[model samples]
Target: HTVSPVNPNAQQTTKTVMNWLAHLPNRTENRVLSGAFGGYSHDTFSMAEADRIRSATGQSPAIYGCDYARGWLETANIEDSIDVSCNSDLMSYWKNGGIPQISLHLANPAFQSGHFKTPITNDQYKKILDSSTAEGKRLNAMLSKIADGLQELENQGVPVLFRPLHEMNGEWFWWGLTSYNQKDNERISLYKQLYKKIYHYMTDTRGLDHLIWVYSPDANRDFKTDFYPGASYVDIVGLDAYFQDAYSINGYDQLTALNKPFAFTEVGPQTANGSFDYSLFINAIKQRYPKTIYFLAWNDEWSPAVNKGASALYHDSWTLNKGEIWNGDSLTPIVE
Candidate 1:
């Protein structure tokens, strides 16, 4: 779907975000907000955040947003990204008794953004025959969907947080690039391919309780991304919102349409124009979507390019930075 763009420097100082995370509240109400990341584990993000939250709350956290398709076949080394196809490595990580949050964006238009240094090769796409495989598929946004559902969750029976095709509400992302590419037929195919495969795999693979199908997308993609997939395919409906906008879930028609719990999948209150008001947004969401869960923002720094002069004039990724994410704590009661 759509993902919050990244700050060009965010990757460089992963520690900066990590340090920021160390300061979040560890105890809220009764449980700790944390889970595991499966698809593209990263020592820095997606995985790193999960690890930190889990550690902070004494419970493993779940992650979904990053993809690992192109990185695999082409043997890409994104420095921070992890490869899950490596059965041993994946199983070993899970065997440790931690939650594994796996997201499959096999490959999408953003493929160039990642592993841009080392593109996928034709040999990598070649399928291995009568089974789950990828080939000639320049994009992974589709492959990961099929692989996620059809593929077992690390051979371990632990429940998995499957974040497939997330952040759709936002437009800059591949599957639901709203501004200009939303109507592209080719892009639609990728979205459908990924959504269908994950759905069927979950139903047929006996991956029952072991899977919590997470259909996370950008929360405001014209408010129409809600139609991206039907409720039948999602166990958890999440919104990937950044800065203050995330606080408006009640205004989003899809926020509670599924009856299932909603998660603030990838959240931060940073927007392009100015500082964010996290307290206001949180109160709005928690109050509105009582069943909502919280996920931390993935970007370390803010980039304005994706959103245009929002963060700056040069970034194309998710161009917006909202400082003071939670300072507003006006206590209006986040989670309306």
Candidate 2:
């Protein structure tokens, strides 16, 4: 059984998010909730900008993401993702009446020599995965601190959609797969073990039940397939598709194949290969991937280079805002 959190309200929010997703198919209108990943330390007011977008287009985002990856370790308390300005950014989003979520872009501290170019050696990976090893205990200790912060939110009746280990399928992080093989077949992959262990430590050892785990990867279908940690460890699966021609049903079908809720965790218009028309992307999702619960943009798109503005990206006829998705001051869940 999932360990119940100290807070009673957290469970309902979990179910509410799941329940809202359940009936998505029946709705005639495109009821997908809009979201934005505000840089918690930088553009922390990305949600505020989302508000501006909504005001212009008459459809504001209902969900927002804040970063907790390096904050507590970096700032002590002056800038923990949980506490900044007058209060926690996560709680601030909740108090401001939006579904609070966290995105972790954790850079491995062990790889000082390699940076992004070299993968962590198999010995280093083994130490973290093997619980009896010293590095394993050290990793758990660090994760315990994260659990402590999340528990603080649970105490205050806020449940977060915690998305950690994002884009692991790509080669940017130390956690990405390095192919070591025998003469016949490949073996010794780190991604699945790392993910399952992290999930176990967070849920079983740390006792944080308030988190709805989201396993997100870049939109590369083959990479997403190869490193998938399985459905048991993930509550929802997501893709970070950007700069693709018409969103269509490309990544959505791949994620839903896991038989869990799916989302576009991060998206934008341009990539090295090409750029997409924002309006066409949104329309494709509305028409094709209607079961997609929420799709979050990267950050502020104020530049004409990125797009014209919120008005250029969002259409009131297509998008649903906080007012439409939730009722009352506190974010009570509703389905359109």
lDDT of 2: 0.60
lDDT of 1 by residue, 144-232 (tens): 44355335552344334567656554454344443532454444444555566546645454334444566776654554343456655
Q: Score every model by TM-score.
A: 0.53, 0.78
Candidate 1, 174: how far from true, in Å? 3.3
Most accurate candidate by lDDT? 2
Tell me the tens digit of each residue's lDDT in model 2 across 100-120. 777654534343221333466
Q: lDDT of model 2 at residue 240?
A: 79
The TM-score obtained by model 1 is 0.53
Each model's lDDT? 0.41, 0.60
Stretch of 10 with least lDDT, candidate 1:
312-321
Q: What is residue 212's positional error in candidate 2, in angstroms?
A: 1.4
Candidate 1 accuracy as lDDT? 0.41
Q: Residue 26 in candidate 2 has what lDDT?
A: 51
Off-target runs (Cα >4 Å) in candidate 1 are: 1-32, 35-82, 85-98, 109-154, 178-190, 201-209, 223-226, 249-252, 271-282, 302-336
